[PDB]
Design a protein around this ligand. Structure first.
Ligand code: NI
Ligand code: NI
Lengths: 146, 147
């Protein structure tokens, strides 16, 4: 239909959802949050597949590390807006790193399966099946702790 | 619930929708489009209300003009993605300007009514009622000339 206007509408629903963070964050914290989020969203524009998922493994050694720091930086805001304890506080440093890897693995697998829904291990290329399964296990463990 | 992750998911539905433009635009044209669209989206971030609608009347004379040029720049891409003729081509220069004004009026009225749905003139503050009604009329006229 009007795919052009639908593009603007999608962006507006994103704006609306983002603005809800103000319910829980003062303007100082909200500005830091949106400044960090912009890094992540610009990366999805530049590097995301057709669904904005990023194949972290295909990035250069430096860009992957940079993208990882951005995610570590944002995790406390996400945890707060999700009503969870801060994973960066509950997990050991080691574990916090494994958590970011697990998140990146999950996103990489969304790229490989081209799926935005619940990933089904059948569709996962064999190079990523074990990695995924472990990543999923580690995420549920982190989940129970926050 | 998980409003944090829901925020990321909303952004990704946007990403997905925007990537569909590649179906109809080669990479050079898509890169120009996304470059121009970033201007508009950064303005919604900075100036939008809670729904990313911008109150163009509340901008300085310069900023308003800049934002208008951005819109005029994007209209041909939107027209193309909407399967329509180019409004910039079908309309006279005068009319194209009026068209941009009518689009801004509509957006301003979404701010004033705080409504993302079909605006109802009842809810529109009196300062904007006539302006809106005319803007709506002019948009249907433009619409008939490009669909
Ligand atoms: Ni929860
Ligand atoms: Ni149409």
């Amino acid at each position: 239909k009007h795919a052009g206007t639908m593009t603007l509408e999608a962006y507006m629903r994103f704006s609306a959802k983002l603005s809800e963070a103000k319910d829980e964050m003062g303007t100082k914290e909200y500005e830091v949050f949106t400044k960090e989020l912009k890094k992540l969203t610009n990366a999805k524009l530049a590097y995301g597949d057709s669904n904005g998922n990023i194949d972290y493994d295909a990035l250069s050694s430096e860009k992957r590390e940079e993208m990882k720091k951005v995610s570590m930086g944002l995790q406390p805001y996400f945890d707060k807006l999700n009503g969870h304890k801060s994973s960066k506080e509950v997990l050991t440093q080691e574990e916090f790193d494994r958590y970011m890897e697990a998140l990146m693995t999950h996103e990489i697998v969304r790229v490989k399966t081209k799926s935005t829904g619940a990933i089904k291990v059948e569709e996962i290329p064999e190079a990523y099946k074990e990695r995924f399964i472990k990543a999923e296990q580690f995420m549920e463990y982190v989940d129970e702790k926050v």
